[PDB]
Design an enzyme around this catalytic site. Structure first.
Site, short mmCIF file in Angstrom:
data_model
loop_
_atom_site.label_atom_id
_atom_site.label_comp_id
_atom_site.label_asym_id
_atom_site.label_seq_id
_atom_site.Cartn_x
_atom_site.Cartn_y
_atom_site.Cartn_z
N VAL A 1 1.84 2.98 -2.92
CA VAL A 1 0.49 3.39 -3.77
C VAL A 1 0.72 4.28 -4.00
O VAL A 1 -0.14 4.93 -2.83
CB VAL A 1 -0.46 2.18 -3.97
CG1 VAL A 1 -0.94 2.70 -5.23
CG2 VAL A 1 0.12 0.99 -3.83
N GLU B 1 8.41 8.45 3.72
CA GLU B 1 7.15 8.45 4.44
C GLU B 1 7.09 6.75 4.75
O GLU B 1 6.38 6.21 5.51
CB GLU B 1 5.65 8.15 3.75
CG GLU B 1 6.22 9.51 3.37
CD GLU B 1 4.66 9.99 1.62
OE1 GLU B 1 4.85 9.46 0.95
OE2 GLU B 1 3.78 11.60 2.49
N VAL C 1 0.86 -0.86 -0.12
CA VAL C 1 -0.19 -0.01 -0.15
C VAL C 1 0.77 1.41 -0.32
O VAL C 1 0.72 2.37 -0.72
CB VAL C 1 -0.79 -0.04 1.14
CG1 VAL C 1 -1.64 1.07 1.44
CG2 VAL C 1 -2.10 -1.24 1.48
N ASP D 1 -7.58 15.08 -45.05
CA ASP D 1 -8.41 15.38 -45.64
C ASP D 1 -8.41 16.38 -46.03
O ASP D 1 -8.07 17.84 -46.00
CB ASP D 1 -10.03 15.43 -45.03
CG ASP D 1 -11.30 15.57 -46.18
OD1 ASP D 1 -10.39 14.18 -47.40
OD2 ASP D 1 -11.72 16.22 -45.74
#
Ligand SMILES: CCCCCCCC/C=C\CCCCCCCC(=O)OC[C@H](COP(=O)(O)OCC[N+](C)(C)C)OC(=O)CCCCCCC/C=C/CCCCCCCC
Ligand SMILES: Cc1nc(Nc2ccc(F)cc2)nc(N2CCc3ccccc3[C@H]2C)c1C
Ligand SMILES: *[C@@H]1O[C@H](CO)[C@@H](O)[C@H](O)[C@H]1NC(C)=O
Ligand SMILES: *[C@@H]1O[C@H](CO)[C@@H](O)[C@H](O)[C@H]1NC(C)=O
Ligand SMILES: *[C@@H]1O[C@H](CO)[C@@H](O)[C@H](O)[C@H]1NC(C)=O
Ligand SMILES: [Mg+2]
Ligand code: NA
Lengths: 984, 261
Positions: A292, A746, A289, A336
């Protein structure tokens, strides 16, 4: 194909209808019941909740959903053991879910707003039709048409069905939407061509009768129409994933792989240490986790929205956020012609007079180079085409621009009147003054228009005869000619020059129209005498020729420079059209698709007077491919031809063939952009990586199939789009690096806490505040950075080698800057612990005693005894101080992420004002989170001392200095080991 | 794999050198931190604004302190008696040799290290000052008769002064039902249940390695039997505060007691 080839008699028995009486009313009703309505079936299977669910799905979205599921399962496991402090699992899960939901809502809102903006151009029409039944002509609705109904046609009708013409008298229709033909085409019963499109005896659904009357039978209705089959083919096309989505998926794969590696290795570590297997599984899920990011998706969406807003400022409407990058990675532009590269309106292009070919201005805004207008020959020719013309302007327009001003009449008449109003100023009032005593319109026998006019001067009433017609018929009627402003007899040299000029002006695809005048003196014709058309008292020969005026559908004003800029950007431009090869080649030469000095195999054969068998193909750089030649080809030959010729033009291509060209280009491994305005482009528009539809000139199908729409019909918006795409690629990778680098700071405290058993340095609420609040703004402000190099000179990125996030970026961000930030935070954590009474050695292994609620007298390094609450407040102090360390390091991190290669001194520290405001905002939010009353109770933040603000500052300076030295070394040695390994 | 052996080894050496440099920087920073701090006095006492209070014997029940025992069955209080003997073993004369007799009756300040091995004097506390609840002549510490003795210990803080006006006192009383029933009667050891003023201030483990916390034993005399009660014991001092909802043990200790009969 059998619809047009069959003659009247067998069609009568085939469709059980009469060529004159018409279809029986009971038969018509039963056939209407059997076949169904004539209206094309519109697909409507797009619910709102389906679109919202799609906006909730995607690579980062699925990663975040799986992360939330993992959090819930880990919380279930922890509840199985009856553990404590599990509310952080829910905090993280709901954080991920809320981010995903808010991001999906923002994207859905953007798409809904774009759809509403585009929808303003839709306009329903009842489309009444004229039909014969029971011998009495009347009107019905468009869908009421049934197969075999005998139907009448007149100028201004929309042709409510595919109709084989049985009777026609000068009927001209436009097929610029279904086909690529700009020039109006005649519908006549006579039939010789196999193709239904080229066949002249059949009309088509989404067309318009420009002039003439006709009557015919209905061959197809509903979705069996040509437009219907084109729409069905477009529906068959399946959209693929956008390049940015592929990049996101690759990045999510990298994230998942790194997370699995770290989780498995630390799970084995937890086994080796002695943790229970369930605890090690929980640690595994925690690491997975932690790898992420949840605030990354929000920043990506905000950057995409900002780029979309910049584009929308320039009338570029994207129907989705992911389309704002595709043009930046585009390698091939299939364009085009009619209506996209050209204005779709016939206008005067060249004037041959005085043995000189002058070029007129064809820009819709009249911003081009003009021709010489100080010749009395020009004045004579101007009077000639002004008096000959019979078209009239729509009332109520004086401030409307002339090229856009509405005119009624033939296309050639409209172009002549517009050219007169541009050269002159009030030709509309000029025409009224001269009386039209004798006026002869275009006739199948005469093949000209004739007009006798009386002069304005009262002294000179001499009659002036002006004639306009086909050059091959006009030239034989002339004896003298205006040359240098005098009347000169015709010799062989003048006829030779006339033939050469006519052939040259016809070789550009421009229709050539001849003009002549003569003076009738009053001795021959009295002024009071009235001229008679049928009497034919005019000489009708020995005329004085004026000149030739050639008209062609011109390129739009901004098209040539935009095409040139795209070519300098490495994007190859292919022209695909349903028009004749002559017009296609002339337009390609005009707009820079075919460069000067680039000649085709036909040109080489003409130059050397050699048959094409001995002509070397490789000598020719340009190439024109017909539709029949494409059909004869096979995919291997088509790929070889695509590779062989750098400049290539496709003419007479059906919608399926355009689709196949796009498929071949995509399958070769390139990102293809398709520009279009008509329904014949909608299949290729849907098949393209990005489809760009013209706004004003576009049709419904083209706009629906397209990802982007140009509201102002400015082709130059494409270069802005590609510039913005390349810029958003660079800025997005910068922002992703900035967001990624803070994952490791972290996560590392959790690893240290688990292994060494120090008191927890960082809490989950602090991590949420870092991810969701403080660092969203600086990473978004990173999207305002200017380009380090020149965007246009660079080649399009290789989709395979050049990735949005590669291993160098991830490695650098995670394990150099992240490592430095982790070291800074741990230094500050140990400073806070030691200055309060807990030496670093005591902290090792202290977690079991630190967290024990039964221990209210735990001793520090000085012997002081602490209760559980005071230790918890020290823990919150550690949370705060480590959070401040991360924020202080991220301030320098965003500055280093400003540029990938250029020095920060080379660019500006303060040129990005949004970045400065973001840094100030981050500092202010951190200060508020720290020093606000009642904070330690709600969010685990404590008012820290100023000394702990300064502890991480040397590490911030270290990050800045290290990145600057790395970029300097990269700049100094472009091809060295340092550049190869240390550049991202 | 994706790189040749030379490239892989070069990048591995570069990362090893980078991490070695980072580790050296971190070690130098921690060394500088350790060199600046004072080994005798904490720099920034912040969460130690008021001493905590602990109780012996400590059985924590489900969440908080919860003492219960069967008066008829001695096995119920055998563990608590063992806990009390184990705690009071530290406050024995054999374990108080390093400390010295101390009857200054005021703040025993020490500006200099005049004790052996460059330490400071610590005033001795011996279990016999608890008299009745010291374990003699009653090894049951009053648990046999339903009159338990509870030892209240105040957490030591370096250079913390409770107050000159009066020696800090301990006050035990009912919390749930003070007004109901007779008020709780408690006998204190030493007299008045005061912590003598010459035990303060604390100078730290380094300065006073033989420092011993002063003890006050509270003996409960009128506790209803077979009834659950909650007893709170607070510290009355000028600089000791017990109004902290987020730390129930700061300046006071609260415990459930249930003496089954
Ligand atoms: C991929 C490679 C990863 C490498 C990770 C490790 C990097 C290096 C870190 C640690 C390894 C060495 C361990 C020691 C480090 C500090 C050295 C030091 O000088 O310590 C000094 C103190 C002892 O004090 P003294 O004897 O000087 O006092 C003398 C005065 N007297 C005696 C009176 C008290 O010893 C101590 O405290 C030791 C305290 C150790 C605390 C546990 C480790 C916490 C570190 C966290 C950093 C994590 C970084 C992660 C990087 C990113 C990875 C993705
Ligand atoms: C204290 C604590 N507790 C948990 N619990 C937990 C979470 C998930 C799971 F699957 C199992 C257990 N996770 C923690 N981190 C590890 C650090 C971290 C960094 C960035 C984002 C999230 C996290 C969570 C993931 C922490 C710091
Ligand atoms: C406590 O234990 C004794 C031992 O037998 C028993 O008699 C008494 O009933 C117990 N107390 C209660 C309240 O049951
Ligand atoms: C210390 O305590 C007693 C009583 O104060 C004192 O008289 C004597 O000198 C010392 N005794 C012991 C055993 O240390
Ligand atoms: C304490 O013991 C003494 C004997 O030394 C005795 O006189 C006194 O009553 C006892 N007090 C209590 C409360 O047990
Ligand atoms: Mg078109
Ligand atoms: Na698309």
């Amino acid at each position: 194909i059998n619809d047009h080839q069959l003659s009247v008699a067998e069609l009568e028995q085939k469709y059980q209808t009469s060529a004159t009486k018409g279809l029986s009313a009971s038969l018509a009703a039963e056939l209407l019941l059997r076949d169904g309505p004539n209206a094309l079936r519109p697909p409507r299977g797009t619910p709102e909740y389906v679109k919202f669910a799609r906006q909730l799905a995607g690579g980062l979205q699925c990663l975040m959903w799986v992360a939330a599921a993992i959090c819930l399962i880990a919380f279930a496991i922890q509840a199985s053991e009856g553990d404590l402090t599990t509310d952080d699992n829910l905090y993280l899960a709901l954080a991920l879910i809320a981010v995903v939901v808010v991001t999906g809502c923002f994207g859905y809102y953007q798409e809904f707003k774009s759809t509403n903006i585009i929808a303003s151009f839709k306009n329903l029409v009842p489309q009444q039709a004229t039909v014969i039944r029971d011998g009495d002509k009347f009107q019905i609705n468009a869908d009421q048409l049934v197969v075999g109904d005998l139907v009448e046609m007149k100028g201004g009708d929309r042709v409510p069905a595919d109709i084989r013409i049985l009777q026609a008298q000068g009927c001209k229709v436009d097929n610029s939407s279904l086909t690529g033909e700009s020039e109006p085409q005649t519908r006549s019963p006579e039939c010789t061509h196999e193709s239904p499109l080229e066949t002249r005896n059949i009309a088509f659904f989404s067309t318009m009768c420009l002039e003439g009357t006709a009557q015919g039978l209905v061959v197809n209705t509903g979705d069996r129409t040509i437009i219907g089959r084109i729409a069905s083919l477009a529906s068959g096309v399946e959209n693929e994933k956008t390049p940015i989505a592929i990049e996101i998926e690759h990045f999510v794969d990298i994230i998942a792989g790194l997370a699995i590696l770290f989780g498995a290795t630390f799970f084995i570590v937890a086994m080796c240490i002695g943790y229970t297997f369930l605890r090690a599984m929980v640690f595994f899920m925690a690491i997975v986790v932690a790898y992420v990011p949840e605030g990354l998706l929000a920043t990506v969406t905000v950057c995409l929205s900002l780029t979309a807003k910049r584009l929308a400022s320039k009338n570029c409407v994207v129907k989705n956020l992911e389309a704002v990058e595709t043009l930046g990675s585009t390698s091939v532009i299939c364009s085009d012609k009619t209506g996209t590269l050209t204005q779709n309106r016939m206008t005067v292009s060249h004037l041959w007079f005085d043995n000189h070919i002058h070029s007129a201005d064809t820009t819709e805004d009249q911003s081009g180079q003009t021709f010489d207008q100080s010749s009395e020959t020009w004045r004579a020719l101007c009077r000639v085409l002004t008096l000959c013309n019979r078209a009239a302007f729509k009332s109520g327009q004086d401030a409307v621009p002339v090229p856009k001003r509405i005119v009624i009449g033939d296309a050639s008449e409209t172009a002549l009147l517009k050219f007169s109003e541009l050269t002159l100023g009030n030709a509309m009032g000029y025409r009224e003054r001269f009386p039209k005593v004798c006026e002869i319109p275009f006739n199948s026998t005469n093949k000209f228009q004739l007009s006798i006019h009386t002069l304005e001067d009262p002294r000179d009433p001499r009659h002036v005869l002006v004639m306009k017609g086909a050059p091959e018929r006009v030239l034989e009627r002339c004896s003298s000619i205006l040359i240098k402003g005098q009347e000169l007899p015709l010799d062989e040299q003048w006829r030779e020059a006339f033939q050469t000029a006519y052939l040259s002006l016809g070789g550009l695809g421009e229709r050539v129209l001849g003009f002549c005048q003569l003076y009738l003196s009053e001795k021959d014709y009295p002024p009071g005498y009235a001229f008679d058309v049928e009497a034919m008292n005019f000489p009708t020969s020995g005329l004085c020729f004026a000149g030739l005026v050639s008209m062609i559908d011109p390129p739009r004003a901004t098209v040539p420079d935009a095409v040139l800029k795209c070519r300098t950007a490495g994007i190859r431009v292919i022209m695909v059209t349903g028009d004749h090869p002559i017009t296609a080649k002339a337009i390609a030469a005009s707009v820079g698709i075919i460069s000067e000095g680039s000649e085709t195999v036909e040109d080489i054969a003409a130059r050397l007077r050699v048959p094409v068998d001995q002509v070397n193909r490789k000598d020719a750089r340009a190439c024109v491919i017909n539709g029949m030649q494409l059909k004869d080809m096979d995919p291997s030959e088509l790929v070889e031809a695509l590779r062989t010729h750098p400049e290539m033009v496709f003419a007479r291509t059906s919608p399926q063939q355009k689709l196949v060209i796009v498929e071949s280009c995509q399958r070769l491994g390139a990102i293809v952009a398709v520009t279009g305005d008509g329904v014949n482009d909608s299949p290729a528009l849907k098949k393209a990586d990005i489809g760009v539809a013209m706004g004003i000139a576009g049709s419904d199908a083209a706009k629906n199939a397209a990802d982007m729409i140009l509201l102002d019909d400015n082709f130059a918006s494409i270069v802005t789009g590609v510039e913005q795409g390349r810029l958003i690629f660079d800025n997005l990778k910068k922002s992703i690096a900035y967001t990624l680098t803070k994952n490791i700071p972290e996560l590392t405290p959790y690893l240290i806490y688990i292994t060494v058993s120090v008191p927890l340095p960082l809490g989950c609420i602090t991590i949420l505040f870092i991810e969701l609040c403080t660092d969203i703004f600086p990473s978004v402000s990173l999207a305002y950075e200017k380009a380090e190099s020149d965007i246009m000179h660079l080649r399009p990125r290789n989709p395979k080698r050049d990735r949005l996030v590669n291993e160098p970026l991830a490695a650098y961000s995670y394990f150099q800057i992240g490592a430095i930030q982790s070291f800074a935070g741990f230094t500050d954590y140990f400073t806070a612990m030691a200055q309060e009474g807990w030496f670093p050695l005591l902290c090792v292994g202290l977690r079991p005693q630190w967290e024990n609620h039964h221990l209210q007298d735990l001793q520090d390094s000085y012997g002081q005894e602490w209760t559980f609450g005071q230790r918890l407040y020290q823990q919150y102090t550690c949370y705060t101080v480590f959070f401040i360390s991360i924020e202080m390091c991220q301030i320098a991190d965003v500055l280093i992420r400003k540029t990938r290669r250029l020095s920060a001194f080379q660019q500006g520290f303060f040129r990005n004002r949004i970045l400065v405001i973001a840094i100030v905002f981050q500092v202010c939010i951190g200060c508020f989170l720290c020093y606000c009353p009642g904070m330690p109770n709600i969010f685990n933040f404590m008012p820290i001392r100023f000394q702990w603000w300064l502890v991480p500052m040397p590490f911030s300076l270290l990050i800045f200095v290290y990145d600057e030295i790395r970029k300097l070394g990269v700049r100094c040695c472009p091809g060295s080991w340092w550049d190869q390994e240390l550049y991202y | 794999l994706g790189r040749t052996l030379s490239r892989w080894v070069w990048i591995s050496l570069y990362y090893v050198a980078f991490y070695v440099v980072m580790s050296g920087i971190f070690a130098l920073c921690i060394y500088v931190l350790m060199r600046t701090i004072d080994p005798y006095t904490p720099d920034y006492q912040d969460q130690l604004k008021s001493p905590g209070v602990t109780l012996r014997p400590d059985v924590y029940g489900e969440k908080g302190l919860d003492i219960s025992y069967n008066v008829s069955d001695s096995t119920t209080w055998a563990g608590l008696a063992h806990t009390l003997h184990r705690f009071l073993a530290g406050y024995s004369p054999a374990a108080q040799e390093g400390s010295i007799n101390c009857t200054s009756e005021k703040y025993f300040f020490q500006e200099s290290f005049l004790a052996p091995n460059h330490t400071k004097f610590s005033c001795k506390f011996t279990a016999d000052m608890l008299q009745n609840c010291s374990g003699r002549p009653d090894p049951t510490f009053g648990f046999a008769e339903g009159k338990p003795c509870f030892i209240i210990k105040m957490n030591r803080i370096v250079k913390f002064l409770p107050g000159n006006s009066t020696a800090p006192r301990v006050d035990c009383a009912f919390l749930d039902q003070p007004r109901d029933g007779p008020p709780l009667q408690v006998e204190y050891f030493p007299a008045n249940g005061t912590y003598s003023l010459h035990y303060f201030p604390y100078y730290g483990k380094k300065a006073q390695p033989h420092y011993s916390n002063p003890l006050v034993a509270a003996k409960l005399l009128n506790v209803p039997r077979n009834r659950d009660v909650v007893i709170v014991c607070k510290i009355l001092a000028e600089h000791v505060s017990f109004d902290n909802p987020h730390d129930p043990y700061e300046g006071k200790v609260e415990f459930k007691l249930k003496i089954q009969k």
